[PDB]
Every structure is written in structure tokens, then in C-alpha cells.
């Protein structure tokens, strides 16, 4: 049948963890989760973001395990956290995104396209300001916009980009 102390303890710990998620127990989650370590980890990812004490690391580790082999559930999440967190150097993230897409050919490509768009917006206002210059940044911004346009292709979004270019 059920284990003497060990099986019952695990079940009770899981129940307690569920109760902690229902009611935030930053402390309960920290000790309950530790006891629970003895797939899955969304609650662990959730507790770090819900109760902080910088919640980005655990998700990265989870995403890293079980790679070799719709799409992957661990991952499509990790990517979203990144852009929102950014909202350190981003280029790097964009590079990582490309790498993932290369390895695996909801499409990640859409997420990658969205990420560049954020950079363009920052570029658009910085360029608009006088402190007064004619080429450089404007040409760079135009190139970025074209690149963003290509990825989406292969209405609201397009409209937004256009507005952005005009302001710049």
C-alpha cells in the first residue's frame, strides 16, 4: 500500500503547496517548496514572481533540462518573461531567440518579431529629439522597421509600426 511516513508526507506537502498558492505564503512557499524538492515547477516559477526576496533564474534552469528530442511547454513561457522583464543588454536576448528558432524549425518567430519592435519604439523617440541630426539613426530605424515587417509577413501591428516611423 502507501508508504509509511514518506508517501503520506509527500501527498500532504503537495496539498499544503496548493494551499500556499491559493493564499500567498511567501514563507510557506519557500519552506514548502524546499520540502517538496525531496516534470512540473510552474508553482515554483509562480512563487518566485508572486513573492520576491529577481524571479528570472529558476525558469531558465527548468527550460534548460530535457531539451534533446504543441512545441515545448517549459520554454514558450521563458521567452515571454524576458521581453516583459526588459520592458542588461537586449540584443543578446534577440540572439538567443534566433538560436532557439534555428534549433527548432505560437511559433517563437512571432515573439522574436515582437521583441525587435520594442527596440524600434525606443529608437523612434530618441531619434525624434533635437538634443538636430539628418542621417544615422533615421536610416538605422528605417532598416529595423523593414526587418520587423519581413518577419511578421512570413493589421494592428503594422499600423503601429507606421505611426512609430512617422514620429521618429
Amino acid at each position: 500500500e502507501v508508504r509509511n511516513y514518506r508517501t503520506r508526507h509527500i501527498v500532504t506537502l503537495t496539498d499544503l503547496l496548493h494551499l500556499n498558492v491559493s493564499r500567498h505564503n511567501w514563507s510557506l512557499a519557500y519552506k514548502i517548496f524546499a520540502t517538496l524538492i525531496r516534470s512540473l515547477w510552474g508553482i515554483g516559477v509562480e512563487i518566485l514572481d508572486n513573492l520576491s526576496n529577481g524571479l528570472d533564474f529558476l525558469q531558465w534552469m527548468c527550460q534548460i533540462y530535457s531539451s534533446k528530442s504543441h512545441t515545448a511547454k517549459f520554454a514558450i513561457t521563458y521567452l515571454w518573461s524576458s521581453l516583459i522583464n526588459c520592458q542588461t543588454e537586449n540584443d543578446l536576448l534577440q540572439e538567443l531567440i534566433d538560436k532557439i528558432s534555428e534549433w527548432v524549425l505560437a511559433e517563437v518567430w512571432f515573439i522574436y518579431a515582437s521583441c525587435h519592435l520594442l527596440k524600434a519604439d525606443t529608437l523612434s523617440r530618441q531619434f525624434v529629439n533635437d538634443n538636430d541630426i539628418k542621417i544615422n539613426q533615421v536610416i538605422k530605424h528605417i532598416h529595423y522597421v523593414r526587418t520587423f515587417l519581413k518577419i511578421c509577413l512570413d493589421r494592428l501591428i503594422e499600423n503601429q509600426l507606421k505611426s512609430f516611423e512617422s514620429r521618429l
Binding site: V2, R3, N4, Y5, T7, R8, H9, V11, T12
Partner: peptide
């Protein structure tokens, strides 16, 4: 279940 109950009891005792 019995084991769990026992554990709970023990915990309670400890608390007391």
C-alpha cells in the same frame, strides 16, 4: 492514511 494521521498527531504533540 493512517500513517498520515499519526504524523499529524505527532506534529500536534510537538507543537503542544
Amino acid at each position: 492514511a493512517a500513517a498520515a494521521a499519526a504524523a499529524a498527531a505527532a506534529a500536534a504533540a510537538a507543537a503542544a
